[PDB]
Each structure stands twice: as C-alpha cells, then as structure tokens.
Amino acid sequence: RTIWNSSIITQRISARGLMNLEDARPPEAKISHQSELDMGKIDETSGE
Amino acid sequence: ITNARTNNDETHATGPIEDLNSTSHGREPEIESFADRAELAMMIQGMT
Numbered sequence: 001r002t003i004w005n006s007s008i009i010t011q012r013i014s015a016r017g018l019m020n021l022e023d024a025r026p027p028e029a030k031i032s033h034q035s036e037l038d039m040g041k042i043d044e045t046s047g048e
Numbered sequence: 049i050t051n052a053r054t055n056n057d058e059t060h061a062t063g064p065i066e067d068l069n070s071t072s073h074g075r076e077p078e079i080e081s082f083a084d085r086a087e088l089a090m091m092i093q094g095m096t
Contacts, residue, residue, distance in 0.1 A: 001090055001091050002089065003088075003090050
C-alpha cells in the first residue's frame with residue numbers, strides 16, 4: 001500500500017465488527033462511545 | 049526559423065555520426081526493455 005491518511009478519518013464509525021474470533025470479544029473491536037447513547041430530558045420550552 | 053507542434057516522432061535531426069563526440073546525427077534505437085509495471089494504488093497485490 002502507498003497512501004496513508006495523515007489525520008483521523010473515523011468520526012462516523014459507530015461499531016466495527018460483530019464477530020467472535022475466539023468466542024469472546026475480538027481484541028480490537030469497537031463499540032460506540034457512551035456519548036452517542038444519551039437520552040436526557042428536554043427543557044420543556046424549546047426542545048433542545 | 050520554423051516551428052512544429054510535433055511530439056510523436058523526431059523526423060527533424062538527421063545525419064551520420066563522424067566521431068564518438070558527434071552531437072548532430074539522427075537517432076539510434078535503444079535496449080529492448082519490458083513491462084516492469086507496479087502501480088501505487090492502495091492495496092495492490094504481489095505478481096511476483
């Protein structure tokens with residue numbers, strides 16, 4: 001391979017790999033960040 | 049002076065060599081080479 005990304009190009013990767021290579025967690029699989037699964041209240045005035 | 053938008057041949061430098069330092073002759077051929085192709089394209093394979 002020749003090209004190489006110089007910076008980070010993974011902000012849109014929620015999850016990588018649902019396998020189980022040894023019937024356990026694959027040692028480099030990525031589950032989503034806890035930031036994207038938050039359900040907080042809304043200020044009852046302007047959604048938000 | 050005259051011009052030519054020509055790049056597919058030479059057809060403009062012709063003559064006999066008169067000395068191993070002669071600088072105005074025609075054109076002689078060159079070693080018959082081969083493909084030697086190896087692009088640089090993000091996970092190309094072996095072909096060894």
